[PDB]
Amino acid sequence: GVTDHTQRLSIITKDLFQVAFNRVARGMLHQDHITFAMLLARIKLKGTVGEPTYDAEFQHFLRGNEIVLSAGSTPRIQGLTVEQAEAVVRLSCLPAFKDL
């Protein structure tokens, strides 16, 4: 019942993502469903327009533990434990969270 081609294209793209996720994740363990959902989300983020590439932010999400903290570089922050302290001084390297 759909006649316009742009609406058909949008429906085809969304249904491609949905049917691919359904037919993959039915034969797949429940710990990894969110992983494939995240991969398809990043793929659709790449495909859409009007957005930045989010390369450095996803790099700090994936290999953000690769940031090396210096000896005694963490100051004292109230409430947070040592793991939260090293996490916030690792997040502070990003320009978006510079004043964290």
Curated annotation (Swiss-Prot):
Domain comment text? Dynein heavy chains probably consist of an N-terminal stem (which binds cargo and interacts with other dynein components), and the head or motor domain. The motor contains six tandemly-linked AAA domains in the head, which form a ring. A stalk-like structure (formed by two of the coiled coil domains) protrudes between AAA 4 and AAA 5 and terminates in a microtubule-binding site. A seventh domain may also contribute to this ring; it is not clear whether the N-terminus or the C-terminus forms this extra domain.
According to its UniProt entry, the function of this protein is described as:
Cytoplasmic dynein 1 acts as a motor for the intracellular retrograde motility of vesicles and organelles along microtubules. Dynein has ATPase activity; the force-producing power stroke is thought to occur on release of ADP. Plays a role in mitotic spindle assembly and metaphase plate congression.
SUBUNIT field:
Homodimer. The cytoplasmic dynein 1 complex consists of two catalytic heavy chains (HCs) and a number of non-catalytic subunits presented by intermediate chains (ICs), light intermediate chains (LICs) and light chains (LCs); the composition seems to vary in respect to the IC, LIC and LC composition. The heavy chain homodimer serves as a scaffold for the probable homodimeric assembly of the respective non-catalytic subunits. The ICs and LICs bind directly to the HC dimer and dynein LCs assemble on the IC dimer. Interacts with DYNC1LI1; DYNC1LI1 and DYNC1LI2 bind mutually exclusive to DYNC1H1.
Family, per the entry?
Belongs to the dynein heavy chain family.
UniProt disease link = Charcot-Marie-Tooth disease, axonal, type 2O: An axonal form of Charcot-Marie-Tooth disease, a disorder of the peripheral nervous system, characterized by progressive weakness and atrophy, initially of the peroneal muscles and later of the distal muscles of the arms. Charcot-Marie-Tooth disease is classified in two main groups on the basis of electrophysiologic properties and histopathology: primary peripheral demyelinating neuropathies (designated CMT1 when they are dominantly inherited) and primary peripheral axonal neuropathies (CMT2).
- Report what the protein is called: Cytoplasmic dynein 1 heavy chain 1
Q: Which organism is it from?
A: Homo sapiens
**Record's subcellular location:** Cytoplasm, Cytoskeleton
Tell me the disulfide pairings in this chain.
none
